[PDB]
């Protein structure tokens, strides 16, 4: 506990241990930029917070893409308009909404809700928001600190943009299911998934030492059976029927998404140009960090072609829990 680094939560260990993976990364995929931080789920403490080179992950905003659809999910559940086990067709992974096409990356056909994360289906994050209304999901995007710039006392922190939900045309809504028309910081998205991982309650992410006095508390944005399931669907994602197994850890049940941002080019959207993030916890079922990452325009994917953050996620979750003296879960 008590130590000379106090009054910051900013663990040495935790933040070498995240600063060597995330530039190792950064150059041996010869990117621009890359971003990683690691939050403590008990307190919301920020035990490490890293840019290579500039504060990217708090004034950087970008469309989170699929990193979206476990909230899209975790609101649907809360309002119980479908359970984990409930059905959506995705078909042939092409549908058409008020005459825009929706794709999945291939044809899913029936999946359960749980599926539709495992799989990172579009079409089935479309067809389980059409079940809510703009407000309902307005309002989450707002419970989770979407839109808001952090305050954690760094000035310029980007607040992101959130169209007002009065304006959204249906297939925005069905966009940002699937989490385009948004834009969010590095920074938003891991404090957004510490509600996942503590049991429905959004915690204030802090870069300073919290009271066992006073345990810190936030607002219940979703309900705790609400979470334990989506932390289940998130431990399905790193599996091999999941789209990212390259993030799992040895020894670890971890969970957690990935998403792609493509540069916007006014209407359209640029070729290879792209920002990999990924966003997750550990250990399942009840994790102790979060763990966010972000890998801007990589040119040399290698193995891991656009999906370059699970693997940065995956050492940085390892080595951290390792440095905190968490015994493996997972033969």
């Known amino acids: 506990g008590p130590g000379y680094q106090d009054p910051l939560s900013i663990d040495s260990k935790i933040q070498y241990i995240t600063y060597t993976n995330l530039k190792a990364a950064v150059e041996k995929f010869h990117a621009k930029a890359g971003a990683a931080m690691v939050i403590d789920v008990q307190t919301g403490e920020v035990l490490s917070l890293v840019n290579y080179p500039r504060n990217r992950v708090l004034t950087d905003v ?7 659809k476990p909230f899209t999910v975790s609101l649907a559940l809360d309002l119980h308009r479908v359970t984990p086990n409930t059905l959506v067709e995705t078909g042939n992974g092409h549908f058409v909404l008020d005459g825009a096409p929706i794709t999945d990356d291939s044809g899913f056909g029936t ?3 749980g599926g539709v994360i495992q799989k990172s289906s579009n079409i089935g994050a479309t067809k389980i928001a059409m079940t809510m209304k703009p407000e309902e999901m307005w309002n989450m995007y707002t419970g989770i600190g979407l839109g808001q710039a952090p305050k954690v006392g760094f000035p310029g922190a980007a607040a992101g943009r959130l169209r007002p939900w009065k304006n959204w045309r249906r297939i925005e809504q069905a966009t940002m299911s699937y989490g385009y028309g948004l834009s969010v910081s590095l920074f938003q998205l891991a404090r ?11 915690m204030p992410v802090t870069i ?6 006073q345990p810190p508390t936030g607002p219940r944005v979703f309900s705790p059976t609400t979470a334990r399931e989506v932390r289940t669907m998130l431990e399905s994602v790193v599996s091999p029927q999941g789209t990212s197994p390259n993030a799992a ?14 540069k916007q080019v006014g209407r359209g959207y640029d070729h290879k140009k792209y920002r990999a993030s990924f966003v997750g916890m550990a250990p399942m079922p009840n994790p102790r960090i979060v763990v966010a990452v972000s890998v801007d325009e990589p040119t040399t994917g290698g ?16 080595d951290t829990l390792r440095a905190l003296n968490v015994p493996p879960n997972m033969p």
């Open 111 to 113: 999946l359960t809700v």
């Open 62 to 68: 970008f469309e989170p893409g699929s990193i979206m």
């Open 303 to 318: 193995h891991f072609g656009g999906q370059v953050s699970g693997p940065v996620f995956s050492a940085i979750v390892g």
């Open 208 to 213: 300073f030492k919290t009271n066992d006095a």
């Open 249 to 262: 850890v040895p020894g670890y049940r971890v969970g957690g998404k990935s998403g792609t941002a493509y």
């Open 192 to 202: 957004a998934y510490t509600a996942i991982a503590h049991d429905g309650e959004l």
